[PDB]
Amino acid sequence: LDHPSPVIPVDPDACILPDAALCAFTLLDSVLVTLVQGPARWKMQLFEQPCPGEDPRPGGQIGEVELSSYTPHFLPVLCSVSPSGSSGGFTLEDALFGLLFGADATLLQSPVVLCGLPDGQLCCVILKALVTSRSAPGDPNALVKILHHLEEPVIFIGALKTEPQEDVHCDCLVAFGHHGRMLAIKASWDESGKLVPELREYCLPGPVLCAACGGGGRVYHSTPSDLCVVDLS
């Protein structure tokens, strides 16, 4: 942004990982995630991003997987989610985090990266658990898992501070669709003296065309007619 007519061409020097086939990508702290189309199998990767203020580099790829589950307009989408204790992502609450991803990611304090897929499948992967090499390929059946299949593609993933009583520790998980199934998720701990997840597949209007989150369980979304809000709080 320092950047040594008010139009500016980029020189191809500014190119890093010319992978060419990459459709999505997201960011954590010191870690970079892409997600790249190939043959049948789409592969998530995971590179370094040099923590010293150097020549702007990828590094060596740490790992790679195949989202075997997916076989192919709509780009798929990536969101990271770190748990409490540990940045442009989201933090959940320890109850939830443990609820969705399991002990491993809780114990590792491991960021977990959600990909939204044109299928409509909403897949998480634990990042710690993705470090491989030529000698050591990632098994997807192990390593990538699948929360809940909206039958329609994905537009926007977030999470929300219901019960609000910069780093806010959210208690509910948000998706959205094109045709407009939402799916918010929660921790209950109810009726059996045991933690259960609270699913809610609502049905909004229309084509949904983007989304966001504002303070206090208020999701600012858009249909073709109108900019409309939903409250969960």
């Binding site: 010191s30 870690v31 370094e48 923590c51 740490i62 540990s86 002990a103 491993d104 114990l107 590792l108 304090q109 990042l127 710690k128 658990a129 993705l130 470090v131 098994d139 192990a142 390593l143």
Partner: peptide, 25 residues
């Protein structure tokens, strides 16, 4: 290695043919 790594490159757990992270504790 496993817990203290937030800053360096990720050093991972033994895979889920191996034992699960609490079996390691």
């Amino acid at each position: 290695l496993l817990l203290d790594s937030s800053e360096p490159r990720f050093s991972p757990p033994p895979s889920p043919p191996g034992p699960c992270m609490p079996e390691v504790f």
